[PDB]
Amino acid sequence: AIAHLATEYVFELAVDKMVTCIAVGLPLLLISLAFAQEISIGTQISCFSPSSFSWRQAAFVDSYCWAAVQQNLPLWLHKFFPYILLLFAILLYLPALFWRFSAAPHLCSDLKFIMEELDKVYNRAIKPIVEQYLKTKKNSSHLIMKYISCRLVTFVVILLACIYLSYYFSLSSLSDEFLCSIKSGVLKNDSTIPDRFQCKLIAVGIFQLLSLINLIVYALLIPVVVYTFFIPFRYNDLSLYNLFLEENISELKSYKCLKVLENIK
Amino acid sequence: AIAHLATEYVFELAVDKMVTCIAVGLPLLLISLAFAQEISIGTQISCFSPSSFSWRQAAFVDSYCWAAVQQNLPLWLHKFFPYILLLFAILLYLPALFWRFSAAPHLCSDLKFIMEELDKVYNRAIKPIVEQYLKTKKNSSHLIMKYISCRLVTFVVILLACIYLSYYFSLSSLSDEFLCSIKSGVLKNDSTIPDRFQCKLIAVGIFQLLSLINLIVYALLIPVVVYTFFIPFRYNDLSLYNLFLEENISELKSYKCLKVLENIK
Amino acid sequence: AIAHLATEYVFELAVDKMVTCIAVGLPLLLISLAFAQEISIGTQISCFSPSSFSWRQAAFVDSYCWAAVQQNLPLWLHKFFPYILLLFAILLYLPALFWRFSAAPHLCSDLKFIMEELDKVYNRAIKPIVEQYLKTKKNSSHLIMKYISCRLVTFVVILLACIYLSYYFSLSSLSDEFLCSIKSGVLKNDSTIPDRFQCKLIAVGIFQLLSLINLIVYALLIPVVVYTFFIPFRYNDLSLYNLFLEENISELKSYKCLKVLENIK
Amino acid sequence: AIAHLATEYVFELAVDKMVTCIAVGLPLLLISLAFAQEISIGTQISCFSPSSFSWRQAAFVDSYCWAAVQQNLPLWLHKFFPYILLLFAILLYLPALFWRFSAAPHLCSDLKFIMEELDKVYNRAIKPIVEQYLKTKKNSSHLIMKYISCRLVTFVVILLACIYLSYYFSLSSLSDEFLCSIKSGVLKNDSTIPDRFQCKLIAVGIFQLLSLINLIVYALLIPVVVYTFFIPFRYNDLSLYNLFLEENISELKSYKCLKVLENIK
Amino acid sequence: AIAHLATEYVFELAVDKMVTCIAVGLPLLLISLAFAQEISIGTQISCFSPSSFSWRQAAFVDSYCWAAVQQNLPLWLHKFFPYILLLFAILLYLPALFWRFSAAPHLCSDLKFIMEELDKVYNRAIKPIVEQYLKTKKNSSHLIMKYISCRLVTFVVILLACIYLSYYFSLSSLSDEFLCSIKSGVLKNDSTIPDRFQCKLIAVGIFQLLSLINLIVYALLIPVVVYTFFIPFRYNDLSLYNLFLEENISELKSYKCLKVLENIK
Amino acid sequence: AIAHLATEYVFELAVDKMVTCIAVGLPLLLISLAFAQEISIGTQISCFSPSSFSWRQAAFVDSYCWAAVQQNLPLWLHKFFPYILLLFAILLYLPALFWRFSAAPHLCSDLKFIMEELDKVYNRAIKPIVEQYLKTKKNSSHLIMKYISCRLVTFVVILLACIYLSYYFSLSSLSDEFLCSIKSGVLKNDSTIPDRFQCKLIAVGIFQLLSLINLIVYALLIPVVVYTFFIPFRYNDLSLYNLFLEENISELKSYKCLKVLENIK
Amino acid sequence: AIAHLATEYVFELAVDKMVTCIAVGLPLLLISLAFAQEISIGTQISCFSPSSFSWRQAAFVDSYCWAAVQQNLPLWLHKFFPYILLLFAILLYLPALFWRFSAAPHLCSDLKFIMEELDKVYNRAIKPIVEQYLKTKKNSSHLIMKYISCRLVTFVVILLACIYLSYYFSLSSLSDEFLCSIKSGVLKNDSTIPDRFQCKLIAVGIFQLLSLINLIVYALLIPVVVYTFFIPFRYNDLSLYNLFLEENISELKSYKCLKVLENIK
Question: Which one of C262, D67, F185, G146 has the lowest number of neighbouring Cβ atoms within 10 Å?
């Protein structure tokens, strides 16, 4: 049931995790809404098998035509549509996976050092190596390149998704039906068989609507991703550390005091 | 079995969690009651395939017509009805997700500071920075804007749901049946085929009743949500903190003593 | 298998938890016995499709008539019977959920204070604020209103269930069969189709027996619920706290000694 | 597979837990052996649909007759047989559930006090309130009434099971077949339909054997339950506490020494 | 897949646990190999329904004949064969369950006392109540009676299994086919129906081979069980305690030293 | 999906655990690749039922012939092939199970003693009973007999597997088809039935390839097993302890120092 | 649903773990995308059974031809394609498994020693055996041989995959159809049967696209694997330890300080 999907979701900067969780989670959700669960009914294609065709002859036409999709461009998309959404899902996850593997371990070690030293600064203020170290990160653009690349690849893939979905949704209405033919090889010569079988890719009607839903959300997601490039308003690694430091304020025992002190004073 | 649904539910202010758990949990429940489990029987559409149609020709009509729904407005709704309830479920969860990600971390850090300092006030009373800090939150409307927006979006979405469900329920009875036709493309010319196939969206009868159930609960849920706007009776951030402080009284070791002392004295 | 149901059950005052666990658990069990597992066999309706009808034409009649139930009152009940039992299950759980969310947190904080102070009284007896506090709860009717309302709503819903089940069981035997017709819209004019199809709601025979089982248990459950209103024999909040204190005697380290001392002395 | 059943079992006095685990576990096992797993094959009824009947007309007869069971006493039993075994299973569990909820909490608190004081007696013997308390339980028949009632209800239900199973097994062989008729309402007049359909409740052959198995085990279980009434050989509450004390000897650190000392001396 | 069976096994004296794990685990395995997984194909019986019989008439014959097995002895066995192996599995587990419930708690308490005192003897040897206690167990035959009975019942049941399996395997080849007839009651008179239907209990071919496998393993298991009776070579309870003490040498911290000391010295 | 198989594996000396994990894991994998998952399609046998045979008559032939396999040697193998691979899997696991139960507990107790004493030797070297004990194990061949037997039985079973698989693979291509006949008993006389039905054991084509895969891996596994017999190059128990000591060097805190000291010095 | 696949992945040097997780995870993913989930529809082959063939005769052709694939090279591949991808998956995992079992335990013990001694060097620097030991690893090529072999086998298998996939993808389009014949043995002579049946390996169209996807990723993966051979830019074991030391910098408490000190200074 759909609840077994929704509860699988209802029950690394925060906005970028949200962007990724949307960017990846939605198409995986939509695929699970599209090809799976009972709205899809029993089959993906069916065709006017003649009344003379046996139950398996008719099933042979339907299954042959499901291959014959690849032998026209919208039909090719309409068949592979779940995998194409999955491909976008994977391609949107990879920036976060690359971030996790290539950038997050350095940032983790740096932030943990920074936070502990800043708590020492507060302890000593009650009672500058870290500042010089931070002022050295001020003279660096290594980790921000990784971050920008992750945001930029996400932005590019989202645009490719929006382009693909806009094209797909616009073309879908014209082309959920096609004129298959089983007449090939030897049995091309079979006079008992119609020259072409009309077939409907029954799932295309679902994919059309859900492509629009995916397009709308990604069209909403583009400006949120674009906003990530406004880094100094949110271009040196220190600015990225500062943003992650502002994120990790939850851990700054000192800041929980010092911000209250500042806010009153 | 339905118990596998009900036990999935039977076994952030409290009222707002209740509102959200109702607002989101019910449609997910109703979808799982509607399209899933054996009350739905074997298929979503079926049609008068002529007695001359083969078992798969008849299945082709049923499956073609399940696409032909989209080629009339009630039929379009009747097909997508599970996803539309799911859409409302997601749109009702998002206020709480936004609250969790955008408001709850600030509030958590603030409340934990406030509660500890108030326990210190009690300890010192046995044996004003926090008050000045609270009196500073008295001069703020930042977090209450987030809260009001969450309540307001929930209210708006619930009204959109109530409007949609009222419309759907009112129209449903007229329009669970429709006159499909497979006659398209080449086989539009097939003289052996009826010009139109009468079809019934068999699930619509379930969706009709369950839309009314969802409407009634949301009609009950509207005033509970509206009551959330009566904040000073329950418009400055301090009032929101006060309400969350009154919520977190479970944690106020001092209050468990001080309220007994007050209540006796 | 039924063991996967029974073991899901075989493997907040106690009597009220028992009442709730019965009141909610039984219909969820009965639904899982009724519509689910192999006693239900393959389908919920079937009808005399003419011998001229195709396998899918016959399936179309059965599935159409499963919708046509709603187009007569017993048939409407007979279709929705699982959801109506589920509705009673939810409506019987809500008193306990309301109790858990609206009454139990106050009572928890109160009882934990009371129990600790009473252990101090025993410790001091070895070696009156709590009594004055309890004598203040003696002058209150706030929490007992919540309790009475929970018991009263449970009682009301159980009576509504007993009324519904008595009516349903009494009517069921007359009305598991009905005279469907697919003749509607265009194909109302189809001369090849019988004017009406006789159909049997095959599951009704199970629902009849299980409604009686549910009725009998709830008829047994009514006096147990009624007994809950005899509060001073078991009308001020202190009496409710006293009953919950008598419940929580398991926690009263002092009472485990003091009752032995009293019982000997 | 049957191993998924058997391993669910293969992988409160002990004898009474054994009795209950048998009394409840066996019918739940037998039901899972009876109506479930592949020995049951595909269907519960089938009937001589005429060769003129369609595949769904024939399925309509089978499913109609599965309802027509209730419209003769052995047929009524033969249909509901799984639920009747389940009913016995629940009715045999309830004594233990009642024991767990109504008697075990008092007994737990009493035994834990008794055992600790008896360890103190041993500690003081190395280096009488509990005896006077026990001699007070010697003047009581409260908890033994609960115990006797649990044993007596179990005994009664087991006898009712043995009576039912003996009757069912004895009658089963005569009555796994019956002469259904679909001829009712309008289509009572259908000349194309046989006046009666012969049907076999195919599962009855399994239920017959398994009823005998259940009967034999319960016939073995009766004397074990009867033995529970020989309390003073195993009628005052102290005797019940003594038996539970003899059970809990596993916890008596002193007895592990004192019994060795006694056994040598 | 078979791996989901094998990994359920691949991934109380040791030899007796091995014997029990074989004696019980193998038939449960074989049943899961026999009636379950795809080697069994789609059905347990099928019969020469005449070409005039409908698909459900033919299914009615097959399912009727699956009941008619019980209306000839090999057929009766061939149907119930899974439950008969399961019956042996349960009857082989019961000795170990009886051992666990009736003998192991005494033995556990005794061994734990014995082992601790023997470690004290070693500690005092570095720096006789237990010996007198053991020499008292030397004058006892209580627990060894329980053990012998467990081994003897296991031996008896294994022989009954070997007898049954030898008989079944020897007879199986003759009698996987039988001449059913549906001609009973009213439709005994149906001239359109053959006087008898030839049927094959298709699974019998699997049960034949697997009965031989079970027989061979149990024939191997008999002497291992018989070896258990050679107790003084492995008739007073001390000898049983000695064997369990030799088993629990893993726990004897002293023996890990003392045996090295002995082995060198 | 195959990933649910592969991840079940992708996600006691080491080489012997590897050998066992291969020897047992591969056939269990191959069976799960062979008879299970969608490559196997819908059925194991099918046959030329005449066009006059009903759908169930044709299913009766297929299912009868699945039994008639046993009424020719390659057909007998081709049917039981999954169980024969499983039999090899179990027979290859038993050496490791026997090792775990019969040899590993002694070895565990010995190694743990040895390792602790060798750490004491290092501690005393910083600041010979174990050597004399080891020099006593030098005069023993008890545990190495168990080890050799485990390796030898594994080697024997692997050769029996390689022989069986080589034979099976070589014969498979000739004999995936056979000439069944249902003509037996009464209906041997049925003139409407062909004297023989040609059948194909459709799965044999998969078993052929996978038998070669199993053969190749086991042919690779033979020399690895043979290498295990080169014990003194890797015949007294000390040599086995030495090999297990070299294995457990991971635990030798001293060796982690002493080997560095040795390697530098 | 595809989300149940993707979330199984979305939710030993790092680059080599990434390479392995890609190299192994992708084909397992693609197989689960290819042969499994609803895009594959109901069957792998179907064929032009004549209209005279029964539903099971037609199923017999389809299933016979699924065997007849092996009685032409592309057809043989097209059938076994899932197992061939799985074979590559296993063959790509084995380098990492061999690394885990044969190289990682030595490296683990070495690194843990090295890291602790380097922390001692820092502690002593606040307040050369390890250097001499490392300079001894400088004179070794044992572990780097294992590493190079793991990288080289991975590279070889990836090239074999790329070769296979390039060939398969290039040939696939020509050869998803083939001219089966059931005419063999006795029924070779059946005049009612066509001399050849045209069949389509319906899944080949999916395998074609997914082979290209696998090829593209592995073509991307080749240079990443090739880069692993540039060891001294990333040929003595010390260089491998240095790379693993640079990996384990996350553990070097000293380096977290010393690198900050170095970076500032």
Answer: C262
Give G46's contacts in chain A (Cβ within 8 Å).
56, 59-60, 63-64
Q: Are G79 and G214 in contact (CB under 8 A)?
A: no
- The residue type found at G116 is E
Residues 6+ apart with CB under 8 A from A42: B43, B59, B63
H or E element that contains G264: helix G253-264
Reading the block at residue D152, the tokens are 């007596």
Q: What span, in angstroms and rounded, lies between the C-alpha atoms of F202 and G60? A: 10
The widest CA-to-CA distance across chain B, in whole angstroms, is 99
Phi, psi of E179 (to 5 degrees): -100, 85
Please list the alpha-helical segments (H only) found in chain F: 2-10, 14-34, 55-68, 73-98, 104-126, 129-137, 142-172, 204-228, 237-247, 253-264
Distance, in Å, from the CA atom of F136 to the CA atom of E140, rounded to the nearest integer, reads 39
Q: How far apart are CA D162 and CA A241, in angstroms?
A: 77
With an 8 Å Cβ cutoff, are E55 and D58 in contact?
yes
Distance CA F35, CA D198 (A): 40
Q: How far apart are CA B158 and CA B222, in angstroms?
A: 7
Element (H, E) at D45: strand D45-47
Assigned token pair, B157: 């979405």
Which ranges in D229-247 belong to alpha helices (H)?
Answer: 237-247
Spatial separation of the C-alpha atoms in residues D107 and D112, rounded to whole Å:
8
Asked if C18's CB is within 8 angstroms of D79's CB, the reply is no
Which residues have C-beta within 8 Å of that of residue C209, sequence separation ≥ 6?
A: D70, D80, D83
Q: How far apart are CA C220 and CA B69, in angstroms?
A: 51
CA distance A217 to A22: 8
Phi, psi of G136 (to 5 degrees): -80, -45
- Neighbouring residues of D81: CB distance < 8 A, sequence distance ≥ 6: D34, D168, D203, D204, D207, D211
Burial of F59 from C-beta contacts in 10 A (0-12 / 13-18 / 19+)? buried
Report whether F218 contacts F156 (CB < 8 A).
Answer: no
B201, containing H or E segment: strand B197-201
* B45 membership: H or E segment, kind and range: strand B45-47
Resolution in A: 3.3
CB F225 within 8 A of CB F89: no
What does DSSP say about strands F197-201 and F177-180: parallel, antiparallel, or unpaired?
A: antiparallel
DSSP string, B106-150: HHHHHHHHHHHHHHHHHHHHH--HHHHHHHHHTT--HHHHHHHHH
CB D133 within 8 A of CB D109: no
Domain count for chain D: 1
Distance CA D246, CA D96 (A): 20
**Hey, how many other C-beta atoms are within 10 angstroms of the C-beta on A217?**
19
Q: What values do phi and psi take at D46, rounded to 5?
A: -150, 160
* Nearest CB neighbour to C59, from listed D5, D56, D184: D56
DSSP D214: H
- Shortest distance between the Cα of B130 and any Cα of chain C, in A, equals 25
C56·B51 Cβ contact <8 A: no
Residue with tokens 């990530």: A228
Q: How far is CA C222 from CA A146, C156, C213, E236, in A?
A: 68, 9, 14, 61
* DSSP letter, residue B195: S
- List the C45-47 sheet strands across, edge first: C45-47, C197-201, C177-180
The rounded distance, in Å, linking the Cα atoms of A56 and G49 is 8
Question: Which approach determined this entry?
Answer: cryo-EM
Q: Which domain holds residue G212?
A: 2-43+79-173+206-253
How many other CB atoms are there within 10 angstroms of residue C169's CB atom?
A: 19
- Helix orientation angle between A14-34 and G2-10, rounded to the nearest 10 degrees: 150
Angstrom distance (rounded) from CA D249 to CA E109: 10
D28: which chain C residues are within 8 Å (Cβ-Cβ)? 2-3, 6-7, 10
